[PDB]
C-alpha cells in the first residue's frame, strides 16, 4: 500500500533516516545522495519520493515541477489556539550576525571581510544577502565582494570555499552537506563563533539555539548572546533580541516537496509518521524523535514542532511568495525559466 522513499543528503542524514526507517517498520525507507541538487534529481526520476528543503531549493525544484506538500512549523506565540498542523506558518528571520568585540563592522563595511554562508543557493545564507549585495553594488561579481568565505557548493579552489574545513580528516572541503564542518545554519554560525569569519548569514533562531547553554556542543557551550550583534540594513548594530527590527528579510519555512503525482501519498504517510515520532508523538522521546538530531538539523530543523498542512493548495511560486521569487530571479540572472536539470 503505502511506502515512502526519503532522500537523505550526506552520511549523517543517511544514518538518521535509517533509524527512522527501522522504527517505521519500513513504512519509510531511504535513498542517499551527495547534494540536495542530486536528491531532487532522484525524485524527478522517481527513485526517491520526497525530502524537506530550504526555500531556495524549493525554487529550483519548482521549475522542475516538484511541489510543496507540508511545511515546517516551529513554536508560535501569536496564532496559539490552533493545533500546530493547521496553524499558519510564520516564516523565519534572515539575519547577519557578528561579534560585538568586532567594533565598527556594519553592513556598510562588509566589503573585503570574511563571510560564513549556510550553502550556495539557500535562503538566509545566500539568496537574500547576495541579492542585496548585487543590488546596491550594481555588480554581478559577488565572488569578489568578500575577501574569503565558506560558501558550501561553490568551487573548492575559489575564494568562496577558502574558509571551509571539510570533515574530521580535511576531506570533502566545501561540500554542501553536513560532512563540511561549516555547512548549514549551525556550521555557518560556528564559522563566526570560532572567528574563522567576520559575519555569518543565518537565521535568528540559530543564534539563540547555540548560546547561553542551549547547546552542549564544545564550540558553543561557552558562547553568550550578548557577545553577538545583528547588522541592520540602516547601518546600525543591535542586540540579538531585536531581530524583529533588524533583519534582512522574512524567509518562507523549509518544506517537504515531492513530485506532484506522489503528493497525496507522501502527505498521508508523513501525517501518520509525525503522530508517531513527532513533538508529542506516541513514541517520542522513548524510541524515536523525527525532530531531534542534537542541534545538527538532520532531515528537519531541530526546532520543528510539527509539519503543517498548507491550505490554498499552493503552487511553489505562491508558497515562496512574489517578493521572494523576484529576488531569486534577479539574483539568478547573475550567474528565467527551465529546470536546472
Ligand atoms: C528568534 O529565535 C529565537 C529562538 O527560536 C526565539 O526564541 C524562542 O521564542 C519562543 C516563542 O516565541 C520561546 O517560547 C518558548 O518558551 C516558553 C518556556 O521556555 C514556553 O512556554 C510559554 O508559555 C506561555 C503560554 O502561552 C507563552 O507566553 C505566555 O503568555 C502570556 C502573554 O504572552 C503571559 O501569561 C500571562 O501573564 C502576562 C503578564 O505579563 C499577562 O499579560 C497575560 O495576559 C497572561 O495572563 C506569559 O507572560 C507567558 O509568556 C509562551 O509563548 C510560551 O508558550 C513555550 O512552549 C515556548 O517553547 C522560546 O523559548 C524561545 N527560545 C529561547 C531560547 O528563548 C525568538 O522568539 C525569535 N524572535 C523573533 C523576534 O523572531
Ligand atoms: C534587487 O533589485 C531588483 C530589481 O529592482 C528587485 O526587483 C523587484 O523589486 C520589487 C520588490 O518586489 C518589485 O516591485 C513590484 O511591485 C508591484 C507590487 O507588487 C504587489 O505589492 C502589493 C502589496 O503587497 C500588491 O499590489 C500585490 O499583492 C503585490 O505583492 C508589482 O506588481 C504590481 O501589481 C499591482 C497590483 O497588484 C499593479 O497595480 C501594478 O501595476 C504592478 O503590476 C510590480 O510589478 C513589481 O513586481 C519589482 O517589480 C522587482 N523589479 C524587477 C526588475 O523585477 C529585487 O527585489 C532586489 N533583490 C533583492 C533580494 O532585494
Ligand atoms: C505502516 O503503515 C500502515 C498504514 O497506515 C499502518 O497500519 C495501518 O494502521 C491504521 C491504524 O490502525 C489502519 O487504519 C490501517 O488500515 C493500517 N494499514 C495496514 C494495511 O496495515 C502502520 O501503523 C504503519 N507502521 C508504522 C510503524 O509506521
Ligand atoms: Fe533556510
Ligand atoms: Zn503507497
Ligand atoms: Zn521585515
Ligand atoms: Zn493558488
Ligand 6: centre distance to CA 204 (Å): 12
Instruction: Please state, in angstroms and rounded to a whole number, the distance separating the CA atoms of residues 68 and 267.
Output: 10
Instruction: Please state, in angstroms and rounded to a whole number, the distance separating the CA atoms of residues 82 and 77.
Output: 11
Do residue 60 and residue 174 come from a single domain?
no
Do residue 195 and residue 259 come from a single domain?
no
Question: 208 in ligand 1 pocket by Cβ < 6 Å?
Answer: yes
- With both helix axes pointing from N to C terminus, report the angle between 322-332 and 55-63 in degrees, rounded to the nearest 10: 80
CATH of the domain at 131: 3.40.190.10
- The answer to the question of residue 155 being in a domain is yes
Number of domains in the chain: 2
**Which residues sit opposite 140 in a β-bridge?**
none
Instruction: Please state, in angstroms and rounded to a whole number, the distance separating the CA atoms of residues 44 and 259.
Output: 7
Instruction: Please state, in angstroms and rounded to a whole number, the distance separating the CA atoms of residues 334 and 123.
Output: 16
Where in the sequence is the domain holding 69, given as residue range(s)? 2-73+255-316
CA 76: distance to chain centroid? Answer: 19
The coordinates were experimentally obtained by X-ray
Question: 77 in ligand 1 pocket by Cβ < 6 Å?
Answer: yes
Do residue 97 and residue 40 come from a single domain?
no
**Which residues sit opposite 262 in a β-bridge?**
none
- The answer to the question of residue 334 being in a domain is no
Question: 327 in ligand 2 pocket by Cβ < 6 Å?
Answer: yes
Do residue 151 and residue 194 come from a single domain?
yes
Resolution, in Å, please? 2.4
DSSP reduced 3-state for 260: helix
- Ligand 3 atom with the smallest distance to the CA of 23 is 27
- The answer to the question of residue 339 being in a domain is no
Instruction: Please state, in angstroms and rounded to a whole number, the distance separating the CA atoms of residues 166 and 17.
Output: 22
- The answer to the question of residue 340 being in a domain is no
Summarize the annotated binding site for Fe(3+) as residue ranges: 54, 92, 185, 254
Strands 228-231 and 114-117: unpaired
Instruction: Please state, in angstroms and rounded to a whole number, the distance separating the CA atoms of residues 12 and 31.
Output: 13
Cell digits for 125? 545564507
Is residue 301 within 8 A of residue 74, CB to CB? The reply is: yes
Do residue 140 and residue 284 come from a single domain?
no
Amino acid at each position: 500500500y503505502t511506502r515512502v522513499v526519503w532522500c537523505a543528503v550526506g552520511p549523517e542524514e543517511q544514518k538518521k533516516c535509517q533509524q527512522w526507517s527501522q522504527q517505521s517498520g519500513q513504512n519509510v525507507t531511504c535513498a542517499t545522495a551527495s547534494t540536495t541538487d542530486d536528491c531532487i534529481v532522484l525524485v524527478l526520476k522517481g527513485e526517491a519520493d520526497a525530502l524537506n528543503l530550504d526555500g531556495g531549493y524549493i525554487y529550483t525544484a519548482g521549475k522542475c515541477g516538484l511541489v510543496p506538500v507540508l511545511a515546517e512549523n516551529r513554536k508560535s506565540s501569536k496564532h496559539s489556539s490552533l493545533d500546530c498542523v493547521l496553524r499558519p506558518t510564520e516564516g523565519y528571520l534572515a539575519v547577519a550576525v557578528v561579534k560585538k568585540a568586532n567594533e565598527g563592522l556594519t553592513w556598510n563595511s562588509l566589503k573585503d571581510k570574511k563571510s560564513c554562508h549556510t550553502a550556495v543557493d539557500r535562503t538566509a545564507g545566500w539568496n537574500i544577502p547576495m541579492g542585496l549585495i548585487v543590488n546596491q553594488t550594481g555588480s554581478c561579481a559577488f565572488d569578489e565582494f568578500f575577501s574569503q568565505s565558506c560558501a558550501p557548493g561553490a568551487d573548492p579552489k575559489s575564494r568562496l570555499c577558502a574558509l571551509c574545513a571539510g570533515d574530521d580528516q580535511g576531506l570533502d572541503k566545501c561540500v554542501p552537506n553536513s560532512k563540511e564542518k561549516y555547512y548549514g545554519y549551525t556550521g555557518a554560525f560556528r564559522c563566526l563563533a570560532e572567528d574563522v569569519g567576520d559575519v555569518a548569514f543565518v537565521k535568528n533562531d540559530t543564534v539563540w539555539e547555540n548560546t547561553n547553554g542551549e547547546s552542549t556542543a564544545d564550540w558553543a557551550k561557552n558562547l553568550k548572546r550578548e557577545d553577538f550583534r545583528l547588522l541592520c540594513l540602516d547601518g546600525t548594530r543591535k542586540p540579538v533580541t531585536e531581530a524583529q527590527s533588524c533583519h534582512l528579510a522574512v524567509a518562507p519555512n523549509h518544506a517537504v516537496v515531492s513530485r506532484s503525482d506522489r503528493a497525496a501519498h507522501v502527505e498521508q504517510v508523513l501525517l501518520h509518521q509525525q503522530a508517531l515520532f513527532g513533538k508529542n508523538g506516541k513514541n517520542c522521546p522513548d524510541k524515536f524523535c523525527l525532530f531531534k538530531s542534537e542541534t545538527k538539523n538532520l532531515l528537519f530543523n531541530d526546532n520543528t514542532e510539527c509539519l503543517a498542512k498548507l491550505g490554498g493548495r499552493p503552487t511553489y511560486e505562491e508558497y515562496l511568495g512574489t517578493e521572494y521569487v523576484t529576488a531569486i530571479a534577479n539574483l539568478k540572472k547573475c550567474s528565467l525559466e527551465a529546470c536546472a536539470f
